[PDB]
Amino acid sequence: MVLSEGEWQLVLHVWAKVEADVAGHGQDILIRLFKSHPETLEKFDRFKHLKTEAEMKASEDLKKHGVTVLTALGAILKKKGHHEAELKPLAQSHATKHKIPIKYLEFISEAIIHVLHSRHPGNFGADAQGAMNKALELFRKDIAAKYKELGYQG
Ligand code: HEM
């Protein structure tokens, strides 16, 4: 699939706002993921013990990881589709080391959309959300294709 320049502009415009507070956005997104789909928390040996949202909010380690994740996602989005290089190491670790099914990538996509919608209503109207969804679908399709090449496609 291919996004138009106009769609990339809507994506990068809302992402510029997210970048004003990467740590806060990372926290909100991961917590949303873990609360909505608790099964995903089981994949993290380091966070598996967190029992409540309060505990999740207080975790310095979870917050640091959220920053790592958003920074990696941000680099991919800024490539505007030309992310083959950035996708390789990411797909390898998530397929082979962490073993993350595509289904879980859909869950985090939903968490990202939910948080942008709550925090940036003025910059995340219907068109902007459509563009973000298309960007994340492209991301998932390309990761799924790499998963298959690596022997996982899980
Ligand atoms: C937009 C989606 C995603 C991005 C950009 C992303 C990015 C990253 C990055 C950059 C790291 C660091 C180095 C590495 O291991 O490759 C990481 C680690 C990891 N990721 Fe993701 N990830 C995503 C989604 C997921 C999902 C949905 C799951 C699980 C439900 C997952 C589970 C993990 C685990 C288990 C680790 C290692 C945590 C640790 O160091 O203890 N990832 N991810």
| CATH number for 6 | 1.10.490.10
Count of domains in the chain? Answer: 1
Name the residue of 76, 100, 103 whose CB sits within 8 Å of the most ligand 1 atoms, as the mutation to test its pocket: 100
DSSP 136: H
Q: How was this structure determined?
A: X-ray
* Residues sharing a CB contact under 8 Å with residue 59, sequence separation 6 or more, in sequence order: 47, 50
120 labeled binding residue: no
Distance CA 7, CA 23 (A): 25
Contact 132, 14 (CB under 8 A): yes
Amino acid making up residue 15: W
Residue 60: how many other CB atoms lie within 10 Å? 7
Atom of ligand 1 nearest to the CA of 136: 1
Instruction: Tell which residue, 74, 77, 93, 78, has the closest CA to residue 139.
Output: 77
Residue owning tokens 């399709």: 141
Which amino acid is located at 8 in the chain?
Answer: W
Distance in angstroms (rounded) separating the CA atoms of residues 10 and 25: 18
The residue segments making up the domain with residue 43 are 1-154
CA quadruple 44, 142, 108, 68: dihedral, nearest 10: 60
Cβ 62 vs Cβ 30: under 8 Å: yes
| Count of CB atoms situated within 10 Å of the CB of 96 | 12
Tell me the best of 31, 69, 104, 142 to mutate to test the pocket of ligand 1, counting ligand atoms within 8 Å of each CB and taking the most: 69
Residues with CB under 6 A from ligand 1: 40, 43-46, 68-69, 72-73, 90, 93-94, 98, 100, 104-105, 108
